[model samples]
Target: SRPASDPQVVEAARKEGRLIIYSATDQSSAQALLDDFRKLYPFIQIEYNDLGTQAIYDRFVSETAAGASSADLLWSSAMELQVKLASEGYALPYDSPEAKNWPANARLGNLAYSTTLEPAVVVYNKRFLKPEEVPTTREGLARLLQEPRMRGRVATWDPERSAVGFTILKADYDRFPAFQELARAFGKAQAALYSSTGAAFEKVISGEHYLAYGFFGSYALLRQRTVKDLGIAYLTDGTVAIQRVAFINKRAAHPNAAKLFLDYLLSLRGQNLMAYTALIFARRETVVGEATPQALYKAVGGKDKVYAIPVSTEILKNLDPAERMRFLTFWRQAVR
Candidate 1:
């Protein structure tokens, strides 16, 4: 048998010629993840299809079932969706030595591997929120937004709609009572709601909102490339760390190529690229950004505050269709 990194598999991968990836990450970030692979295996052309977490799963199921071309690598920040597919036998299982070195949460049973540690944080407009006044803990943030002066100046994801946003809320709810407090504060303040991090970040950038909770730190870090009014603050009360995950299709058209890239992505080199090139926090092992996973943990409590929310079907507790409407009832009241 040719292992993922074996010379025999590498050659077979080259003959495969191309690999297609359907990911929730945008084009630039997705391309950044494959830049080094492109250089190393110039013969293996890459097709990056940037789409949403839900769309990637929905489209892949229909398209692949049609006996037409489909994704070789399926990736998303919607961690539960990835787990759902893998658990349902949609993913091709393979052993990778690289994954063994990663945290248990990052490499889930050798099927789904989280490529980045994307921590959701509180982001504010520097022009409005002061350097010192910006709160790093959820309680502090809730109290600040609870203030009459800060009312109507806060924005956050509408958990009633967004998949990723809801995951953060569910995870935070389990993490502490801060979630309830924040929801109450938001409801009382009539806080604004957005469906995407990029949209919410833009609102904060424009000063339409002074602060945003559960904003993607990586998104703001990338936007900081061109915009300067953003201030990213990690929650001292513990930030919900989400992983952007990847898994091979069960019937991958380019199986060899898929395994090859899969192995690479779970490696230290690929993770470093994920950090520097993609502007994501690569892993618990490497410290790329100013607030390394270590520092981020320090703010919350200590080493035990634990980054990387478990990559498990447990997140599906938020996705159950049976309870969705009931959950939406609470969400509507909480956000209004």
Candidate 2:
């Protein structure tokens, strides 16, 4: 029932002079989207921050709780954190005139939305593992990690430290049995855990490690283009993907600008541009190589095999402190 933005809204936002965005997405990937928005609305200025998912979420929460100046728009890949904030009344609800075209699943009637369709994947060194040796499913990955050659040569995100890692691992735990089995498998192999994907990927592509678990496939594919032996794969049994969530801080430094940019991202041109730059977009209609959600589903063996993490109160169930700690216990048990 939310209507499109009026001229007055755009005018007001222009008067604000600048819009600040805090996002987990890399600057390189988001540059086109920002550049295009500036081209369309030369009036409103832009300030973008790239940070770890939890870091930005904590920054937003801390600043707002203290009633301090904070980001105008918050677009993070941490879907559950964004949902929890919006549910807890930390997001400023708005209607974008352009949001109508976003898939019903991408748009939250309340305004917090998902901006991209990203997959969780296994990353491996091109030189270390043969193409035929690549693990196609989580269960297979678990067993593969135990191989004598791969022993101590496996790297993955540490659930207790990495927010995205925690999300993917928990989703693996709840949505499928492979996650637990992988944990136990990893434990048996003494796989090294990291707080960042870059750390794990660096070790892996350099041949320091043969495989890395729990990394975004889109980013992994991008890395593959540069990292000598990096490879991306979807789990044949189940592939869990996340939608990068977007929302305006309820206590924004600039709401009108937030609205404008939010709408811009959901617009047809923006979605296409996002797909081109990020290699992933939520709209099923986006067609840009193997990057689009449409293509990702197709490559992974169709829709039923791709699990797009839902953005709703349901995600809140696994986000509680105790629930997270319990999950960590299992993660550590296998982390050994």
Candidate 3:
């Protein structure tokens, strides 16, 4: 039997030469991170593929069924989906050195790990919405929709189609009565509904819309690199910070490389790279100064109000396909 950190295993990994990573992150952000990782580890080639969370799951099932498991790692914002995969024996057990101090909830039975903690926030085009003009709380946003001037300018993705969208919608519905009312208001306002965060951000950036809910904070970070007028605001009310998880495939061709990559993802250096380059890092203790989101919140003295939404296997079980379709149907009709 090989020790977990055997030099022979490392040599074998280097000989394998490459690892495949399937992720649901935005293409631009993933590409940027991939480039950075390649620069750091010039010997290990990474084949990164960006797919929607749902699409990645479908491909996982198909590939596993065909006995052609090519992916060495899976990184996605859909925590529940990754949890399901971990539960079903699809993931390999990995106990990275960085896992020692990680929160218990962030690890899934030692099979999957969350690399980043991301909160869904409202992003708007500053060209159209003054900082004072934007709503800072969910209730305020609801009231803003009642105003005729803001009608048709507020947008969010259809929850049924996008994982991040669905998670944010679920968080809203679970926490507030205003969410349902706001959905109805959106129907009446003819608010734009997009399929992905990228599309939602594009619409807002182009000035076709003034506000977009369900915009991933990471997306806003990536966009800020090239676009200047876009701004993101955390809701004054508590928000959900979903854990973006990554797992090693059970039948990985480069197992040691996969573990090394996962370790890098959770290390202080790697987390700092993520924070510096726009992705949120999950380790609250390691974050310092204003380099991390937690630090930023601390500097603003808003920790008391900041809350993390609950993550449970029950959330996945409760997502009924029939109910999902019904909700989407109503949303489409209302928007139309």
lDDT of each: 0.76, 0.78, 0.73
lDDT of 3 by residue, 292-318 (tens): 667536532475555454334555643
lDDT of 2 by residue, 1-336 (tens): 122568898888978979999998878667877778888888887989988988988898888878889998988877778888877888887876776666666656665887777888888876878768987887788878778777889887777777777777788888887778888888888889887778888888778788887787767766766776778767878888888888888877779889888877776677777666665544546456557877777767888997777767678777787887888777777776
Q: Please give the lDDT score at residue 142 for candidate 2.
A: 80
RMSD versus native structure for model 2: 2.5
Q: What is the lDDT, from 0 to 100, of the residue 54 in candidate 1?
A: 68
Ranking by TM-score: 2, 1, 3
**Could you give me the TM-score of model 1 versus the true structure?**
0.91
User: What's the true lDDT of residue 147 in model 1?
Assistant: 76
| Full-model lDDT, candidate 2 | 0.78
Return the number of clashes found in candidate 3: 0
Candidate 2 residue pairs in backbone clash: 4-97, 126-229
Among all candidates shown, the one with the greatest TM-score: 2
Runs in model 3 lying further than 4 Å from the true structure:
1-9, 281-284, 288-291, 295-304, 307-312, 320-336
The lDDT-based order of candidates, best leading, equals 2, 1, 3
